[PDB]
Amino acid sequence: SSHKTFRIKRFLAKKQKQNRPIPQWIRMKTGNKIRYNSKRRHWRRTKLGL
Amino acid sequence: AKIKARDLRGKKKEELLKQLDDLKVELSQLRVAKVTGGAASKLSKIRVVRKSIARVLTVINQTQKENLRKFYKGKKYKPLDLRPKKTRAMRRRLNKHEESLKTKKQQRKERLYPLRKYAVKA
Amino acid sequence: NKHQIKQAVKKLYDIDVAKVNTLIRPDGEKKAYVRLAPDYDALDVANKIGII
RNA sequence: CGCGACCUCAGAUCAGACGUGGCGACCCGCUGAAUUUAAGCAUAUUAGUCAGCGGAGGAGAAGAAACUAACCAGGAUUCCCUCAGUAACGGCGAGUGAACAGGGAAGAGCCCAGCGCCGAAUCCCCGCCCCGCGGCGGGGCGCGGGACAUGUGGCGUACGGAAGACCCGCUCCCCGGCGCCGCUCGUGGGGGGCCCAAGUCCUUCUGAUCGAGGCCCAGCCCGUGGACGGUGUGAGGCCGGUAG
RNA sequence: CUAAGGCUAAAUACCGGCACGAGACCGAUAGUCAACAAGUACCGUAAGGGAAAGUUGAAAAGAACUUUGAAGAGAGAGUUCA
RNA sequence: GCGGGCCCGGGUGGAGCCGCCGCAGGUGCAGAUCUUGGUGGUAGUAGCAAAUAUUCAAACGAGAACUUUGAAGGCCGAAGUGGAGAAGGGUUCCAUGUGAACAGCAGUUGAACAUGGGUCAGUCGGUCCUGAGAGAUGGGCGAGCGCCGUUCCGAAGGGACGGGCGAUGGCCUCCGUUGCCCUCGGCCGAUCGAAAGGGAGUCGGGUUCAGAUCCCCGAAUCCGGAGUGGCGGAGAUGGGCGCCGCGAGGCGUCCAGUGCGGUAACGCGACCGAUCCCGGAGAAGCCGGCGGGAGCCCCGGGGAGAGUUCUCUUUUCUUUGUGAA
RNA sequence: GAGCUCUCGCUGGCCCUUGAAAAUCCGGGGGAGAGGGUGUAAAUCUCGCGCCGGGCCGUACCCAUAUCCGCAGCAGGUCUCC
RNA sequence: CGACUCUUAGCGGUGGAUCACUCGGCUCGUGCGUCGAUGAAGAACGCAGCUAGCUGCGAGAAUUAAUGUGAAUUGCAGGACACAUUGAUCAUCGACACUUCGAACGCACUUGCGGCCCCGGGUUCCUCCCGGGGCUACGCCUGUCUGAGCGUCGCU
Numbered sequence A: 001s002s003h004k005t006f007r008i009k010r011f012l013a014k015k016q017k018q019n020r021p022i023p024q025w026i027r028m029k030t031g032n033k034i035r036y037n038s039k040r041r042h043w044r045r046t047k048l049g050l
Numbered sequence B: 001a002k003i004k005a006r007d008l009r010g011k012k013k014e015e016l017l018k019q020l021d022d023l024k025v026e027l028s029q030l031r032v033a034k035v036t037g038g039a040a041s042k043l044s045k046i047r048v049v050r051k052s053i054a055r056v057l058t059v060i061n062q063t064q065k066e067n068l069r070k071f072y073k074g075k076k077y078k079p080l081d082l083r084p085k086k087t088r089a090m091r092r093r094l095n096k097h098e099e100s101l102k103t104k105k106q107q108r109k110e111r112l113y114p115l116r117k118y119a120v121k122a
Numbered sequence C: 001n002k003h004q005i006k007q008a009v010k011k012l013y014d015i016d017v018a019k020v021n022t023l024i025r026p027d028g029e030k031k032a033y034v035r036l037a038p039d040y041d042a043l044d045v046a047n048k049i050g051i052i
Numbered sequence D: 001c002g003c004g005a006c007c008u009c010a011g012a013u014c015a016g017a018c019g020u021g022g023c024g025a026c027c028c029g030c031u032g033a034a035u036u037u038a039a040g041c042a043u044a045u046u047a048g049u050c051a052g053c054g055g056a057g058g059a060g061a062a063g064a065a066a067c068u069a070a071c072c073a074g075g076a077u078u079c080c081c082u083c084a085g086u087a088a089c090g091g092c093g094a095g096u097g098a099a100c101a102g103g104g105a106a107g108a109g110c111c112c113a114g115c116g117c118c119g120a121a122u123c124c125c126c127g128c129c130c131c132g133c134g135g136c137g138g139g140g141c142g143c144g145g146g147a148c149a150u151g152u153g154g155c156g157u158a159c160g161g162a163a164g165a166c167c168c169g170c171u172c173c174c175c176g177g178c179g180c181c182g183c184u185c186g187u188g189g190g191g192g193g194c195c196c197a198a199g200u201c202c203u204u205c206u207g208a209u210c211g212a213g214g215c216c217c218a219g220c221c222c223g224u225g226g227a228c229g230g231u232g233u234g235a236g237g238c239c240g241g242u243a244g
Numbered sequence E: 001c002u003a004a005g006g007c008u009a010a011a012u013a014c015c016g017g018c019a020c021g022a023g024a025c026c027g028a029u030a031g032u033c034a035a036c037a038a039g040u041a042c043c044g045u046a047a048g049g050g051a052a053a054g055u056u057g058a059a060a061a062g063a064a065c066u067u068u069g070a071a072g073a074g075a076g077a078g079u080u081c082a
Numbered sequence F: 001g002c003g004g005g006c007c008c009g010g011g012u013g014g015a016g017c018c019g020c021c022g023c024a025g026g027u028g029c030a031g032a033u034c035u036u037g038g039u040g041g042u043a044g045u046a047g048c049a050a051a052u053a054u055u056c057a058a059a060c061g062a063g064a065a066c067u068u069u070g071a072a073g074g075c076c077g078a079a080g081u082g083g084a085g086a087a088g089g090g091u092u093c094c095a096u097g098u099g100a101a102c103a104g105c106a107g108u109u110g111a112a113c114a115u116g117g118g119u120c121a122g123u124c125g126g127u128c129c130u131g132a133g134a135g136a137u138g139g140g141c142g143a144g145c146g147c148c149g150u151u152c153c154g155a156a157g158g159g160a161c162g163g164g165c166g167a168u169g170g171c172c173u174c175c176g177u178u179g180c181c182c183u184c185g186g187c188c189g190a191u192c193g194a195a196a197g198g199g200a201g202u203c204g205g206g207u208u209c210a211g212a213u214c215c216c217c218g219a220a221u222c223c224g225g226a227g228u229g230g231c232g233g234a235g236a237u238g239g240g241c242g243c244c245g246c247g248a249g250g251c252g253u254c255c256a257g258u259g260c261g262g263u264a265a266c267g268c269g270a271c272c273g274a275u276c277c278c279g280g281a282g283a284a285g286c287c288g289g290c291g292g293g294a295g296c297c298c299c300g301g302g303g304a305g306a307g308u309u310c311u312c313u314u315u316u317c318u319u320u321g322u323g324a325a
Numbered sequence G: 001g002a003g004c005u006c007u008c009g010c011u012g013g014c015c016c017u018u019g020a021a022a023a024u025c026c027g028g029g030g031g032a033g034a035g036g037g038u039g040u041a042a043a044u045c046u047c048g049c050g051c052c053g054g055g056c057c058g059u060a061c062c063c064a065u066a067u068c069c070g071c072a073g074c075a076g077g078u079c080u081c082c
Numbered sequence H: 001c002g003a004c005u006c007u008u009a010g011c012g013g014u015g016g017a018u019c020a021c022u023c024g025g026c027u028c029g030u031g032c033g034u035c036g037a038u039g040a041a042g043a044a045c046g047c048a049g050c051u052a053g054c055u056g057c058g059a060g061a062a063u064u065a066a067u068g069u070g071a072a073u074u075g076c077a078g079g080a081c082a083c084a085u086u087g088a089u090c091a092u093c094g095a096c097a098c099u100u101c102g103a104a105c106g107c108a109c110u111u112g113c114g115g116c117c118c119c120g121g122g123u124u125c126c127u128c129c130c131g132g133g134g135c136u137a138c139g140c141c142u143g144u145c146u147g148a149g150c151g152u153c154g155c156u
């Protein structure tokens, strides 16, 4: 909106930082059952209904 | 290079502050090296320096609070952080002196008619 | 604050600052441009701190 | 024209404390229906129930008769069985519906106001000294303050009480510290940590035995230990444990 | 019996909390919605609604290397009792 | 074996299973427009037809109708298919790389995926003010969470000047601060409420792959502080009297001196002043007509660059300026 | 040049419609008080310069026959300037 | 003998039914039975060398101190440690520490505006300015101080 508040900007920054994929070296751990992030958020669907 | 609390217990306050300043300078340099590529050996020192800073600050705080509660030991009124902190209800509990307190009537009754030991069938 | 940034830079790197421009990056971190006085050179202090 | 007491009433970033919210299975105080049944439905029933509000603890509430009974009487409160689907209530329809006594679990009794006698004999706060002070107490020293006679404390409360008269035998209970011996029932009270038996025996299957056969008596050893789990299958004896 | 004043533990209750034990109970469409990054992903402005999803192998020993193809994909070879 | 079903043979499978005597049950499916999951015919079928339109050559590339470059032909035709914002979105923005999946064909392309990078303010806005309204205290009601109401059943301003006292601090000269005493004092309800209302003050050039009235360069401006006033200038250096000196001028004394000019409207760089009172600005509807200024368009020319020139055309096309203060 | 747009200024017409508040700034009426006393001072709603500071938050991009809402790159909807 | 179609069988596809496994549920029972203004429950934002989620933690931020045990953690490097040394990891946890909202407490919720004291930068307290530290909510009890009343009285 280019007129966002500080709280909204912090929320968007945290979501953007969380949107990254899972690192590869996690898969090499002994007790690992995770194959992909499965929580990736795209900006076309799942429009983050603030 | 290992920092242990045993040596830090006896050191003076100014020496501990200087050591803390040196450790913070080293941590800043380690961050600068981290953002400039650096190396695995340099990057592994970040945790060591952070834990050394934590140890120095813990020693400082423990010594300061021990001295402060030594100063207030005996005063009727003490700072809130130095007061015992058990629970909200337990601090509202009775003083343990009023529980043992008995009225003159109760003391008269107990003194005049104490509970006695007895046996039957003999 | 910008005053705090100016004083911190002055105390750390033994430098005098002309002005500071700050912004909040779209990741949660604060980015500050520290303008150096004409007496000192940014390249020299950058070499001294290690970045190049 | 002002000052000095008292009574009512305000201000405080005045000194020291207290309440606010959360959980809410169980508990206490209010408010509080309609689905449903009556083969319809309005009293009834659903139901002092759900929904809503407030308030605590480890339990809460209740509790020591302005009682039950009518008997040759019982005797605080709480819970179990029975009383009893009974007395009773109810378009006397559908339906609703206790209490007493009896047998048990447990069992504990008490305190004020008033009435009156003691020189307020009473209580709170601030200063100093001594002890311990991490659930801030005890004693002493303060013509240092305040509360209180519009009533504090001692005796004393329905089971009677107070004071004298003079009959009888006589004088240990509680609180705060200083340390000490017995480790105090699941047969050493609670919490934590480290440990305590015996085949990897001989052949033979298998990728791998913990399988099969055999070994001074079902076989070799332990057994107050033959639960369990792990170990490349199905292990009392490989390992942790198990019993004590 | 002596109301219009007050206190009191025990026998009682405990689908929440802390730490344990057990089962003629279910065995991944069952059993709590949730055996798994589950009150998560996701939906609605909101009060709220709310999943699907366990299994290589004893041991990754997870297929070196050669060959066709741009690659996805194959043909040989190798590991493993498989 | 009438049957419910059962016993053997073969293959796969790799770790538990069954008979008999009794006990117990969440114990037998073909249907419930049953619940969940999967799979067929339809079917390589309907369809990939709203808004005029593409073609040639080259490059990268394994691969080109869809990418890029150049040329040609077109459309949107300044109420645009152009250039910028508000709400909303939230990294979709920029650079590089891949072509697993998506972009209902394809793709060497993408708003896809993976790495990194990017948002710079006294002057642009929030922040300040109040509007419609919302909502505490006082007060009242309510079993209660709370509700009514915003001046109504309030000891509602903790502020200020001048004077006095007391104290400290700083060359206790001089001043500040704080405390007390006297004195002065209407407001009108705490507070919230507009990124389009009110609200002082910044523009020009350059600059990035992506930011610039924000960065750099150059010119300004607003608010606040300014004590010891940093300076100059205004209050300012007038007259009379008694002397000295040829005179300019110098000395002593009395005073005036909080400015000056114009008949006037008003003007000159300033040109003491409190509690108090008055006024103005902020601060205003819609519509018509006319006039001034600017930007753009139009015409006659000069230059500079340029398409046509098979005939004509002193040719047609583009440009030809200066910020705030 | 009744040329288009913006702006400034006059002049009218309409209302049983009369078309915002506050913050903030300024001018004026008074003289409570101050000044030094004949070269100086108190004052300058500060006349011209000179010195110091201005903190916090937003700033990318789309803004629509593809970056928003309609389950989507949906012939729909969505407030403005040149 | 063709193609297509129908039944059966072998093999190969889609699918995940059945069986066997289970660090998960359901039910009953035992003991204990503890939140918060010294700041609860909950929420937000951050913390790892490489770290998205889960879990853990709070600028001392994948944990500090102390105690017990005693040679590791591990997906890779790096390594601290000499494991003849309080000594790696673990468990316990009694010391210390514990960002922002939230009963949430200077006023509102924008992370915007303030007042009262102290210290430092600037000063040589001089007020502007900057940084740091401690306070500033409501109700209520006891007590203190300062007050009002044509409330009831006493002296002058």
Ligand SMILES: [Mg+2]
Pocket (backbone or CB within 6 Å): A044
């Ligand atoms: Mg959309």
Ligand SMILES: [Mg+2]
Pocket (backbone or CB within 6 Å): B105
């Ligand atoms: Mg008594």
Ligand SMILES: [Mg+2]
Pocket (backbone or CB within 6 Å): none
């Ligand atoms: Mg009926």
Ligand SMILES: [Mg+2]
Pocket (backbone or CB within 6 Å): D039
């Ligand atoms: Mg019926």
Ligand SMILES: [Mg+2]
Pocket (backbone or CB within 6 Å): none
């Ligand atoms: Mg009916």
Ligand SMILES: [Mg+2]
Pocket (backbone or CB within 6 Å): D047
């Ligand atoms: Mg009833």
Ligand SMILES: [Mg+2]
Pocket (backbone or CB within 6 Å): none
């Ligand atoms: Mg009671």
Ligand SMILES: [Mg+2]
Pocket (backbone or CB within 6 Å): none
């Ligand atoms: Mg009874």
Ligand SMILES: [Mg+2]
Pocket (backbone or CB within 6 Å): none
């Ligand atoms: Mg009967």
Ligand SMILES: [Mg+2]
Pocket (backbone or CB within 6 Å): none
């Ligand atoms: Mg009495």
Ligand SMILES: [Mg+2]
Pocket (backbone or CB within 6 Å): none
């Ligand atoms: Mg086993």
Ligand SMILES: [Mg+2]
Pocket (backbone or CB within 6 Å): D235
């Ligand atoms: Mg075994």
Ligand SMILES: [Mg+2]
Pocket (backbone or CB within 6 Å): none
């Ligand atoms: Mg053993």
Ligand SMILES: [Mg+2]
Pocket (backbone or CB within 6 Å): none
């Ligand atoms: Mg399930």
Ligand SMILES: [Mg+2]
Pocket (backbone or CB within 6 Å): none
């Ligand atoms: Mg067709």
Ligand SMILES: [Mg+2]
Pocket (backbone or CB within 6 Å): none
């Ligand atoms: Mg057309």
